[PDB]
């Protein structure tokens with residue numbers, strides 16, 4: 570099953586350390602996040618929000634980029650990776666109306682998204698989930714996990730991505746920092 | 751709402767003219783197709799199958815290709831467009847594992863998918879729906895509609911596409927020919 574749900578509330582595998590409402594409407598602070606592999610039609614007991622998305626095919630990365638990523642990218646669920654950050658992202662209408670070449674040019678040629686992110690591997694593991702096509706309020710759910718030794722580096726990455734051309738099209742962003750229970 | 755369902759059964763806006771089970775498991779012959787904008791968790795009793803997909807962003811077409819398409823592509827629901835064909839398609843695991851550049855090169859550089867398709871406009875109107883990401887048995891639901899005038903041309907187009915490199919990755923395909931009621 571390629572669908573994942575993230576329920577903010579009183580139960581889950583992850584304790585919420587903090588929520589930073591970076592851009593646009595925020596997410597209610599809660600005690601924990603519960604992650605479920607599957608859709609979840611009915612709101613859990615004592616929960617404040619649910620986010621959902623699916624794992625999908627590659628949309629931008631070219632073969633040589635995939636080869637570079639595969640050589641260094643870590644797996645999820647490393648024993649040392651006790652911190653995580655869930656970052657829902659929405660991009661503007663102006664982005665989604667662009668053609669494929671226009672988007673790829675902004676994403677890599679101008680913003681160097683993959684080349685910058687590679688600078689943070691193997692420390693940071695990640696998962697990308699898509700949800701615009703489900704009708705959700707965000708377009709992406711992005712997930713990152715790492716040992717505490719990489720927290721400073723991860724915060725620098727965030728600032729570097731926010732300085733990029735690609736980020737001129739980001740309309741909503743929240744950071745949910747988590748610690749593994 | 752970006753989701754569409756196609757219910758094969760005894761009711762609907764479209765009468766089934768024929769079903770050709772081109773490759774892989776077919777779809778049961780039925781009297782009619784009912785098309786609904788929205789999902790349908792409860793399939794009607796006298797219906798045989800339900801297909802669903804969503805409209806999404808562009809995956810391959812470049813700006814100059816979109817411009818060419820926009821100059822000539824017809825609207826849906828033209829008065830004369832009394833014939834349609836619903837063609838669910840599934841592509842292989844080897845296709846999906848390829849990177850974005852590899853897929854674009856097969857789609858256009860080798861197969862000329864858009865250049866060939868443009869030869870059949872304005873006669874043929876179309877919609878593309880995506881459903882691999884919903885866990886459906888097919889990956890795409892493709893829809894075409896046109897006057898009787900263009901049936902012979904549409905049949906030529908089908909044969910041309912099936913001769914392409916891109917088609918070497920198609921592993922399931924069915925044609926549901928319809929007439930507007």
Ligand code: HEM
Pocket residue numbers: 626627628629630656658682683685686687689690693695697709711726727730850
């Ligand atoms: C940690 C190192 C990172 C690496 C190696 C990396 C790599 C990538 C790659 C290769 C893609 C494209 C996938 C495809 O072709 O479909 C992608 C997409 C994406 N990434 Fe990153 N990324 C990193 C960090 C980040 C961070 C920190 C953020 C958010 C603050 C983020 C947000 C996104 C988004 C929103 C997308 C989807 C873009 C779109 O489809 O428009 N990434 N990432």
Ligand code: HEM
Pocket residue numbers: 669807808809810811837839863864866867868870871874876878890892894907908911
């Ligand atoms: C009638 C003229 C046609 C035109 C102008 C045309 C045009 C296109 C365009 C431009 C795309 C890419 C959309 C994107 O970038 O996301 C596309 C995708 C697609 N089309 Fe066609 N098409 C035509 C006929 C057909 C026919 C007859 C079939 C099926 C037999 C078909 C099957 C598909 C499929 C399966 C995709 C999805 C490809 C993928 O994402 O891997 N098309 N079409």
